[PDB]
């Protein structure tokens, strides 16, 4: 009942998450920013970190944060 | 018979490639409001090779 496990506003950190045939593919990019308000206009592209061969049916998701 | 070995007989839709659906929940074959409970048209979704 734990079918897999692994261990390894001055900035904007971007990520992409997708699944193909059970291969869950993870992409990333980081930069400093000076538009502290909101998303910058100009371009960037993400690059891969890992592909996880996990096989799960996924349709919904949620983020996790620090607490006081 | 060896009953350690089993396969899914029923599902609502086919697997995509490597869709690893392990769930053993009782299958309502339409007619009976099974709500996970055994009975007529409330099938166990697997079978054993025995």
Curated annotation (Swiss-Prot), chain A:
In this protein, the residues bearing a glycan are 1, 57
| Impact noted for substituting residue 13 to K | Partial loss of biliverdin affinity
Impact reported for residue 38 to G: In strain: Beta/B.1.351
Effect on the protein of changing residue 36 to E: In strain: Omicron/XBB.1.5, Omicron/EG.5.1
Effect seen on changing residue 57 to Q: Increased resistance to neutralizing antibodies
Look up the domain of life of the source: Viruses
Q: What happens on changing residue 13 to S?
A: In strain: Gamma/P.1
Q: How does it assemble?
A: Binds to host ACE2. RBD also interacts with the N-linked glycan on 'Asn-90' of ACE2. Cleavage of S generates a polybasic C-terminal sequence on S1 that binds to host Neuropilin-1 (NRP1) and Neuropilin-2 (NRP2) receptors. Interacts with host integrin alpha-5/beta-1 (ITGA5:ITGB1) and with ACE2 in complex with integrin alpha-5/beta-1 (ITGA5:ITGB1). May interact via cytoplasmic c-terminus with M protein. May interact (via N-terminus) with host bilirubin and biliverdin, thereby preventing antibody binding to the SARS-CoV-2 spike NTD via an allosteric mechanism.
Question: What does the protein in this record do?
Answer: Attaches the virion to the cell membrane by interacting with host receptor, initiating the infection. The major receptor is host ACE2. When S2/S2' has been cleaved, binding to the receptor triggers direct fusion at the cell membrane. When S2/S2' has not been cleaved, binding to the receptor results in internalization of the virus by endocytosis using host TFRC and GRM2 and leading to fusion of the virion membrane with the host endosomal membrane. Alternatively, may use NRP1/NRP2 and integrin as entry receptors.
The name this protein carries in UniProt is: Spike protein S1
> What lineage does UniProt assign to this protein's organism?
Viruses, Riboviria, Orthornavirae, Pisuviricota, Pisoniviricetes
Q: Which residues of the full protein are shown?
A: 165 to 245 of 1273
């Amino acid at each position: 009942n734990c079918t897999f496990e692994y261990v390894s506003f001055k900035n904007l950190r971007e990520f992409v998450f997708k699944n193909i045939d059970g291969y869950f593919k993870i992409y990333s990019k980081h930069t400093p920013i000076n538009l502290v308000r909101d998303l910058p206009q100009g371009f960037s592209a993400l690059e891969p970190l890992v592909d996880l061969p996990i096989g799960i049916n996924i349709t919904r998701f949620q983020t996790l944060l620090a607490l006081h | 018979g060896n009953y350690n070995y089993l396969y899914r007989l029923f599902r609502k839709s086919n697997l995509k490639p490597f869709e690893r659906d392990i769930s053993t929940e009782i299958y309502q074959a339409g007619s009976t409001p099974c709500n996970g409970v055994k009975g007529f048209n409330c099938y166990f979704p697997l079978q054993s090779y025995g």
